[PDB]
Design a protein around this ligand. Sequence first.
Ligand SMILES: *[C@@H]1O[C@H](CO)[C@@H](O[C@@H]2O[C@H](CO)[C@@H](O[C@@H]3O[C@H](CO)[C@@H](O)[C@H](O)[C@@H]3O)[C@H](O)[C@H]2NC(C)=O)[C@H](O)[C@H]1NC(C)=O
Ligand SMILES: *[C@@H]1O[C@H](CO)[C@@H](O[C@@H]2O[C@H](CO)[C@@H](O)[C@H](O)[C@H]2NC(C)=O)[C@H](O)[C@H]1NC(C)=O
Ligand SMILES: *[C@@H]1O[C@H](CO)[C@@H](O)[C@H](O)[C@H]1NC(C)=O
Ligand SMILES: *[C@@H]1O[C@H](CO)[C@@H](O)[C@H](O)[C@H]1NC(C)=O
Ligand SMILES: *[C@@H]1O[C@H](CO)[C@@H](O)[C@H](O)[C@@H]1O
Ligand SMILES: *[C@@H]1O[C@H](CO)[C@@H](O)[C@H](O)[C@@H]1O
Ligand SMILES: *[C@@H]1O[C@H](CO)[C@@H](O)[C@H](O)[C@@H]1O
Ligand SMILES: *[C@@H]1O[C@H](CO)[C@@H](O)[C@H](O)[C@@H]1O
Ligand SMILES: *[C@H]1O[C@H](CO)[C@@H](O)[C@H](O)[C@@H]1O
Ligand SMILES: [Ca+2]
Ligand SMILES: [Ca+2]
Ligand SMILES: [Ca+2]
Lengths: 484, 413, 93, 37, 487, 88
Amino acid sequence: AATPAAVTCQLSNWSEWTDCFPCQDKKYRHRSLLQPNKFGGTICSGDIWDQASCSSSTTCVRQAQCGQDFQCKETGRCLKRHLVCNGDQDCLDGSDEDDCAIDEDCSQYEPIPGSQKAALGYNILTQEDAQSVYDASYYGGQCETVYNGEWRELRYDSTCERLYYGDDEKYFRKPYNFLKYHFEALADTGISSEFYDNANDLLSKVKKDFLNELNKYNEKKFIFTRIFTKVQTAHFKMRKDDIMLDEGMLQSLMELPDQYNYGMYAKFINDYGTHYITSGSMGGIYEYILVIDKAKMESLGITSGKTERARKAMAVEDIISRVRGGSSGWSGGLAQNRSTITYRSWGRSLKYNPVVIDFEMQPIHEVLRHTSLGPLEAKRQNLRRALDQYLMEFNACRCGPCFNNGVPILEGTSCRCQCRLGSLGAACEQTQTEGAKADGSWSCWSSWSVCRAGIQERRRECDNPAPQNGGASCPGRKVQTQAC
Amino acid sequence: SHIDCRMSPWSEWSQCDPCLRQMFRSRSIEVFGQFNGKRCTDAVGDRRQCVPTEPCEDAEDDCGNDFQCSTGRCIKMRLRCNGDNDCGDFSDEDDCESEPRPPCRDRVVEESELARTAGYGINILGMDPLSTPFDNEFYNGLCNRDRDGNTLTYYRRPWNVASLIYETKGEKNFRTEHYEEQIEAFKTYQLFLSYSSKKEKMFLHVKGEIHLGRFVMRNRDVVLTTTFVDDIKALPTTYEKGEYFAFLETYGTHYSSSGSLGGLYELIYVLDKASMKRKGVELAVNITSENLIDDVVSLIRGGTRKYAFELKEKLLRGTVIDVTDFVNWASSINDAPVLISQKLSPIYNLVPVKMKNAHLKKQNLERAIEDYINEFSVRKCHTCQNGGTVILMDGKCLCACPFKFEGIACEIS
Amino acid sequence: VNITSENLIDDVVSLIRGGTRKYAFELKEKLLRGTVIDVTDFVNWASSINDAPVLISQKLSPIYNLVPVKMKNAHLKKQNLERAIEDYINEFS
Amino acid sequence: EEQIEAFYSSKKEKMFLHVKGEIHLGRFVMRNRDVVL
Amino acid sequence: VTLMPIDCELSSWSSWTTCDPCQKKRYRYAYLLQPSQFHGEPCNFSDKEVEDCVTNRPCRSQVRCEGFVCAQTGRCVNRRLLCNGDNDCGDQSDEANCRRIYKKCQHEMDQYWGIGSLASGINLFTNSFEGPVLDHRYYAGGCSPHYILNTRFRKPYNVESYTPQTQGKYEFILKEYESYSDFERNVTEKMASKDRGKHYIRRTKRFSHTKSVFLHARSDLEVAHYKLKPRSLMLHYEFLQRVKRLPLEYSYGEYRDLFRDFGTHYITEAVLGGIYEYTLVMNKEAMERGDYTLNNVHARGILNEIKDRNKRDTMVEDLVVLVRGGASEHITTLAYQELPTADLMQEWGDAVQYNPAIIKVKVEPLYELVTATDFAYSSTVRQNMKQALEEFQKEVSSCHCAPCQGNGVPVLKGSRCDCICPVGSQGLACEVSYRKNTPIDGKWNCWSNWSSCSGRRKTRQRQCNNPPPQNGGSPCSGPASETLDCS
Amino acid sequence: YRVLFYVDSEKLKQNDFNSVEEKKCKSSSHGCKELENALKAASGTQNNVLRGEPFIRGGGAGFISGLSYLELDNPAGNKRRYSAWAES
Ligand SMILES: *[C@@H]1O[C@H](CO)[C@@H](O[C@@H]2O[C@H](CO)[C@@H](O[C@@H]3O[C@H](CO)[C@@H](O)[C@H](O)[C@@H]3O)[C@H](O)[C@H]2NC(C)=O)[C@H](O)[C@H]1NC(C)=O
Ligand SMILES: *[C@@H]1O[C@H](CO)[C@@H](O[C@@H]2O[C@H](CO)[C@@H](O)[C@H](O)[C@H]2NC(C)=O)[C@H](O)[C@H]1NC(C)=O
Ligand SMILES: *[C@@H]1O[C@H](CO)[C@@H](O)[C@H](O)[C@H]1NC(C)=O
Ligand SMILES: *[C@@H]1O[C@H](CO)[C@@H](O)[C@H](O)[C@H]1NC(C)=O
Ligand SMILES: *[C@@H]1O[C@H](CO)[C@@H](O)[C@H](O)[C@@H]1O
Ligand SMILES: *[C@@H]1O[C@H](CO)[C@@H](O)[C@H](O)[C@@H]1O
Ligand SMILES: *[C@@H]1O[C@H](CO)[C@@H](O)[C@H](O)[C@@H]1O
Ligand SMILES: *[C@@H]1O[C@H](CO)[C@@H](O)[C@H](O)[C@@H]1O
Ligand SMILES: *[C@H]1O[C@H](CO)[C@@H](O)[C@H](O)[C@@H]1O
Ligand SMILES: [Ca+2]
Ligand SMILES: [Ca+2]
Ligand SMILES: [Ca+2]
């Protein structure tokens, strides 16, 4: 079996302080994950980024200058004048409603289900949601409404004896950052089950007038089933032009230097995500697997005399059962049993708690291009330059092999191998025999080669080990090249 | 022989910190105790009063045109009168005899009982939660109404909780794995030998993970509790290990910058059983052994008292569990959530810039947390025997071994 | 056999911490009678720990750390409490 | 259990059964400074 | 896995257009030469670029308004629509400074269920809905009541009729087959004489049993019929404005990004309701061999005996269920593996009424909305939009994708292609399956460009996935070559 | 309301058996010989096809989807569901 080799955390020494900015009264510096603490090893107290106070010589920029129009007194947003006094809080200070469309009644309808999750950035290294990239609740003077396909909800009236459907939540208000959100009801389910069985029984006898007798029994049984079910409550697409950023992303983007400075750009990638959702699907997913292997073998041999007997038997059952969307109660219920009770109740909870099924996303730098702010090209090129490094430095591929099919993740400076069975480490097992099927998964990038003007290289291995025992190889992009 | 608590000599004392009116002293821990000797209870440092050897500097750290509240805290004037618990305690009634206007207009919105607890302090030793550094009853004048949560009822999201999204997810993982085996043989004056052996192995693993969403804390403009900012004001400014450890032991080495709420159950049965026999006569002998380990363990976390403690034991027994018992427990996670897993930010990130001497305190905390992780290390303890490993606990190092070797160091068999 | 009727089950110990004495007694009585407690019982006990809790584990420091820094001979009293705490270990075997 | 017998000999037993349980209601942690006695 | 992950390649840039007379801008764009697939790089690096200019040319872009110009949206509402107590401007501007309000709607009124979905355009080449193109929240004078059951509805101005045509097909087939065969052949032989003797036996079996079930249930429920007016449509604000941003000069990029936001066509007539479809396939087999023998000889003597016994069994079952329209509990309880009880069917059909899917569509291409009453230079926008629609259909048709394994269907989702798998295979190429063979359906390659004149030709090769592999299914259904006249 | 319903089933079973037994003897040096054989082949098939195509026009969408749902035990459709459709 495999064996671990522990390593403690290391960070590289500080970068020299970035000079004191005009409006923040701040300095920044950074460090790099020279090695994250692996499966065995102490965490660093230190993190990647440090900020410090500093007074500075110049005067902070005038807030009157944006777009020849209104900008809020204590925050980012610059607004077209018809939003001032519209009856709606268009910026964090509420100054766009101070000293007062006009008097909007549109808040009669609550925001669309999941207007929050689609507004958040996303991180491809950790699969986590980030801060708001879009403003989830900016309405841009619009009174626009989506019909709720699920508004149908029973009510009794005890006076005059009627059973009637609520006429509540018939419409939702759509945020300006959403182009279309559609409340299309779909289901698709796909089920495959395969069973294969073999049993073999044999005898042989010889006698001469010496005796020999042999007996064999073998049995194999295989069962597989897979179920996938998805239900859409809605489908959404976020706008590709005139995007209104969240005030936090907006201010953090003002706070970025126009020069390249890996620390402040890497911090924006950490805080606002590597990517942002362009469009996605909402509702619920059920997935289930059973895989069952059984085998039973017996043999006898007798001659004259002596007698010997052997028996071996096996049963290995994997059930994976994952419910996304619905009520916390019925998600546990449907995780535990599948029936016309658990499917029907789970779908009743998707009326109220949908979750993102699958989605499309683009790199965070591609937001700036499309913002209401106008051109930000220098920031965009810096934000790309940092992201192209962030996706190397903070990448889970730098953690250990996670033998027996574990999942590596990096959080903070620190690795977790989420091992699927057995006690954690590089190696992971104590229950399984040494025969187990497990993959090779990526041993990560080299740095770029020394280069000719037209030749430069980057390389990988499939993992530090080969695929374990008999097991799957990696998706196969072993080598890559660059513009030098 | 058994093992006792041990420490360094104390170091040389501090000077008197003029505004703090105290002096400080510290000592290193060197052995915790082990093998049921004299267990530690022993402190890292101590403090003494002094009439200070110099003047204190001007204390007030006023933000200017901002309202300075009865707490340690400044606030922007839009929140001086807002009909709400602005600025970390009520501080406003003498001003707000006019301008009552609430953040939420004509509405009746409740507090998120999950979001109030978001941003737990965490101690990297044991990973226990501690109550929030973050205020989370502060709303920044925003209404920010969510209809979210599976109980179909609105709530007001507090300013530091940038996201709280009820992504319901329910998973069950189940594994069973058996291997089961037998081998047997047989072979005036006479000779015989009879031999038999049987082995039975079972590994069951079950876990059920049930989410009640996730929180992500805000990465700018964080509004902290009056108690926490005060507990940063009252610091030595000179890297006194024991005094900095007293702040770690009340707010954690890290805070959960984002955390996943809900509940978990997990079960194990391991059974590993063997029997072996030989008998014979040769012109009598009779020689046997039996070896069994049987270990069943259950964990439940989250949900209400009744349902959790029912389900905990129903699942440990042979019982074919009712789906509606699961529905009750998993529903009660709405009322009584637990922190399943989380992302950790070192606590010094919540030392606000725009407080006096802030960056010096941060480099002290960064050193102190490194020390707090070092002198509480397991690596100083004496080795366990046989198949065990050195467990760490407060005031003892030890091991225990379900493998036919025994004692507090697994030395005997 | 009828194991719940039989003399055969005897030697079971009991430790039980916290909860309302009725439900602690019922669990002890069943065990010293050589009989299993029903799952109904344990959940009834677990409901009663809301009234009468006990501490399962503790992290410990000597009491002199509570002596206020303002006390008129503070360090001397704390140092004598350390000199006193140290003698308890000899006052008993 | 182990036995070796020849009519050298040795005989061995070790046996137990445990049931162990925890019921947990809440963590408490308390101040090391600004304490009011 | 046999994969190579394939990266997206956009072309080199177009030459710039000369600067536009009315947008004051210039444009350049790339064509997608290869879509990203099998986890190659995510690409989408900006498919269009735009720059400002100095302008040396005249412009006439102000189509006048005898109406009232709405302050925020720029819509021209007819002057009778002001002060009706309703938002006809989109952003309420028509109801400002009104001395009185003159309500037409004497009663409370619903919108027809889902009528807003039909106001958005479709990317007909993928059947995906896109952004809003028509304003079904605009009623003009409105307020003539319509009833479906007892509920009263207000008809949108753009809708010619929404009406409860109400129909249900159900179709059922249950085909079952069983076939079994048994063979046995025993033998015994003996000899003795007063010395010598012999005895011999053989006994045998071969057996097979086979079964198949195909079951297919489909409900096509229709619950409404919809038709749009043929003329004078009130367009949606977000579309009306992106169309006003289009260049007079032909740049493909800025017209393509209209289609990637608002689709290629609009729904002029539609059939609304729900599909329930369930289809089960099962195949089952059992097989056996038995072979037994003795031989015995004597003169001194010898004996041999053998037994061989074999049993094999398999079952393979695939089920697919597909539901469209309805409410989420009915949707999931029909999604479940077991055929419905009629109560669920009743509740599903009852919910389909309030959230229908679209069963059948009559399109019009989106440039038929670009009418001179709303846009200046409309005929040049139409002619550009027509040419872009032909070029775009040649980009977004999924023929560009590399072939899936396991009879996967490739779909070009964006600049990236996903192989949607059948039941019974997994992995990004649909490679991971237990099956020895599965019928590959033939897949067309992209159709080659128009050659010459006096009748042009286009060609197709069925090569992208060759039809025959691993006991292949049907070769592709369309015209393998095609021709059309210059004039 | 229209229903076509169609049920069609076919069964075949076949068994064929053949057997031989032979004997010889001689005496004056005594001897005897015997031979025996048996053979079986058996085969059967079933086909069953059940089709139905309820079609409805008019009525409420739930009553339509309820009535058009084919009970294989009552393929003309049930008195209650059908009367509910006739109400709608
Ligand atoms: C050709 O030879 C085969 C094998 O000897 C014959 O099949 C055998 O048929 C006999 C009589 O039916 C079976 O014996 C019966 O077994 C059942 C239990 O399975 C028992 O309950 C009955 O009382 C009886 O003992 C025998 O098991 C069966 N063997 C196999 C492997 O199928 C076959 O019938 C012969 N055919 C001809 C043409 O004689
Ligand atoms: C989930 O629980 C239901 C409880 O009814 C199971 O359904 C029963 O399964 C048992 C298995 O022995 C049958 O004897 C009962 O007749 C079934 N009752 C019915 C009709 O629901 C269901 O099987 C469980 N889930 C799974 C997938 O096993
Ligand atoms: C076993 O004996 C007890 C008395 O000790 C009796 O109550 C019980 O009924 C017997 N068996 C059963 C039914 O539990
Ligand atoms: C000897 O045989 C007896 C009887 O089966 C058995 O109980 C015992 O364990 C064996 N071992 C001895 C006596 O050493
Ligand atoms: C920044 O890191 C440097 C190492 O180059 C240290 O010397 C300094 O104290 C700070 O840690
Ligand atoms: C290793 O494996 C994944 C596939 O799951 C690849 O996406 C990636 O290259 C990673 O490093
Ligand atoms: C440090 O330890 C010294 C012992 O040298 C004492 O004098 C003092 O009380 C402190 O604990
Ligand atoms: C458009 O394209 C060329 C490419 O060389 C540019 O250089 C130039 O701006 C032109 O207008
Ligand atoms: C025919 O259609 C137009 C004519 O130029 C082009 O897209 C291309 O030539 C095509 O084959
Ligand atoms: Ca406003
Ligand atoms: Ca106030
Ligand atoms: Ca009007």
